Amino acid sequence: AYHIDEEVGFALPNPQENLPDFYNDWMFIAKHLPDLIESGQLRERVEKLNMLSIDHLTDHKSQRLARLVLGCITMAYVWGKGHGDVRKVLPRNIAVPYCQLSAALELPPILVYADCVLANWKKKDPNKPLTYENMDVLFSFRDGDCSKGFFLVSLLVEIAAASAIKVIPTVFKAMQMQERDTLLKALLEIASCLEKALQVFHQIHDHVNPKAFFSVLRIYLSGWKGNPQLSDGLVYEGFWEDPKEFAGGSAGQSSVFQCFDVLLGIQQTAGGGHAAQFLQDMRRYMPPAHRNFLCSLESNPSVREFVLSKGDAGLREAYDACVKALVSLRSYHLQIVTKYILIPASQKGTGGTDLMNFLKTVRSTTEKSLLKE
Numbered sequence: 001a002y003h004i005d006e007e008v009g010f011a012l013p014n015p016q017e018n019l020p021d022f023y024n025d026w027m028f029i030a031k032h033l034p035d036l037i038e039s040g041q042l043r044e045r046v047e048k049l050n051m052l053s054i055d056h057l058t059d060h061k062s063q064r065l066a067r068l069v070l071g072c073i074t075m076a077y078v079w080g081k082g083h084g085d086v087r088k089v090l091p092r093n094i095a096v097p098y099c100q101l102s103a104a105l106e107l108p109p110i111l112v113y114a115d116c117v118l119a120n121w122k123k124k125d126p127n128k129p130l131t132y133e134n135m136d137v138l139f140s141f142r143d144g145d146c147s148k149g150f151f152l153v154s155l156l157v158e159i160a161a162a163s164a165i166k167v168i169p170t171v172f173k174a175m176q177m178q179e180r181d182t183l184l185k186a187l188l189e190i191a192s193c194l195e196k197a198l199q200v201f202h203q204i205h206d207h208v209n210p211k212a213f214f215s216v217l218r219i220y221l222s223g224w225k226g227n228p229q230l231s232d233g234l235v236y237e238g239f240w241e242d243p244k245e246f247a248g249g250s251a252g253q254s255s256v257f258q259c260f261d262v263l264l265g266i267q268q269t270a271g272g273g274h275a276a277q278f279l280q281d282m283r284r285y286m287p288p289a290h291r292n293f294l295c296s297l298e299s300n301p302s303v304r305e306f307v308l309s310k311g312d313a314g315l316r317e318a319y320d321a322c323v324k325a326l327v328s329l330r331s332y333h334l335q336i337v338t339k340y341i342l343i344p345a346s347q348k349g350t351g352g353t354d355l356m357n358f359l360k361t362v363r364s365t366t367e368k369s370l371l372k373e
C-alpha cells in the first residue's frame with residue numbers, strides 16, 4: 001500500500017543482507033569499514049572501484065540494501081577518520097550508480113534514516129521475536145561506534161510505534177462511519193502504543209554510550225547542508241557538475257512522529273519558521289511511499305476538529321492521551337539529546353538544526369494542542 005508493514009511499520013521488513021556477486025567489491029568495502037577506515041585504506045579502495053551498473057539490482061530490497069551499502073561507503077569516504085580531513089568530491093565510479101539508484105528510490109544521495117535504521121537490520125533467529133537480543137545491524141562504521149545500539153534501538157522505537165500506526169485506518173473509518181466508541185478505543189490504543197514506544201526509548205541508555213556516540217558515530221551521520229567543513233556541499237562527480245547540499249541522518253527523518261502530528265492536527269509544518277521548514281524538508285529524506293502516506297493523512301478530515309465538534313468528554317480525553325504521549329516522548333527526547341549531544345559537546349544536529357530551540361519549539365507546538373491544560 002504505502003509500504004507500511006503491520007509488524008514493523010515504516011521499517012523495511014526482512015531486509016536483504018546480500019547483493020548479487022556482481023557487487024562484491026561494494027559489499028566488501030561496506031563490510032570492512034571499521035578496518036578500512038582505521039588503516040586509511042578506505043578512500044583508496046573506493047577510488048580503485050570499477051564503475052558498476054545498477055542494472056543487476058532486480059527488486060526493492062536489493063536496491064535498498066545497495067543504497068545502504070553505498071551510503072555507508074559515501075559517509076566513510078567523505079568523512080574519513082572525522083578529524084577534519086574531508087573529501088569534497090565523491091568519485092565518479094561510486095557517485096553515478098549511487099545517484100542513479102537514489103533517483104530510482106526517490107531519496108537524496110546521502111545516508112538517511114531509512115537506510116541506516118529502517119533497512120540496516122536482521123533477525124539473528126528468524127523464528128524468534130524482534131527483541132534487541134535477537135537482532136543485529138548489517139553495517140557499522142568504526143569499532144566502538146555503538147552503531148548497533150543506536151540503530152537497533154531507533155528501529156525498536158519504530159517497531160513499537162508500528163502497533164499504533166496500524167490503528168490509523170480504524171480512526172478514519174470510524175470518523176466517516178460515525179462510530180464514536182470505535183474511534184475512542186482507537187485513540188486510546190494509539191496512546192497506549194505511543195506510551196509503550198517511550199518505554200522502548202529508555203533502551204537508548206542500555207546500548208549507546210554518550211562519548212562513543214558523540215565523538216565517533218555522529219561524524220558519519222553528518223551531512224553537508226550548512227556544514228562549514230563542506231560549505232558548498234559535495235560534488236557527485238560525473239553526475240552533477242556543481243556540489244549539492246544534503247542534510248545528514250536523523251530521526252527528524254523518521255515518519256513516526258510526523259505521522260501522529262498530522263493525525264492529531266498538530267501543525268508542526270505550518271509557517272515559514274525554521275522548525276516548520278526543517279520538518280518539511282526532512283520529508284524529502286523519507287521513502288516516497290511514506291512521504292505519500294503523510295500527505296494522504298494531511299488531506300483526510302481532521303481528527304482534532306471531529307473530536308472538538310462533538311461535545312464528548314471521553315473523546316477529548318482519548319485525543320489528549322495521544323497528544324500527551326507525544327509530549328512525553330519529546331520531553332524524554334530532550335533528556336536524550338542533552339545526555340548524548342549537549343554534555344559531550346562541552347568536553348547543531350547532524351540534520352542541520354539549532355537543535356535545542358528546534359526541539360523545544362516542536363514540543364511546545366505539541367503541548368499547545370492539548371484540549372485541557
Ligand code: HEM
Pocket residue numbers: 150153154155157158204208213249250251252253254257258330333336337340341348349350351352353354355358359362363
Ligand atoms: C542518542 C540518541 C538520539 C539523539 C542524540 C538524537 C538527536 C536528535 C537531534 C539533534 C535532532 C534535531 C534534528 C537534527 O538536526 O538532527 C533530533 C530530532 C528528532 N529525533 Fe532524535 N535523537 C536520538 C534518538 C532518537 C530516536 C530513537 C527517535 C525515534 C525513533 C528520535 C526521534 C526524533 C524525531 C521525531 C525528531 C524530529 C523532532 C521531533 O519530531 O520532535 N530520536 N534528534
Ligand SMILES: N[C@@H](Cc1c[nH]c2ccccc12)C(=O)O
Pocket residue numbers: 112113116117154218221249250251252341348349350351
Ligand atoms: N540528529 C542526530 C542523529 C540522529 C538521531 N536519530 C537518528 C536516526 C538515524 C540517523 C541519525 C540520527 C544527531 O545530531 O546526533
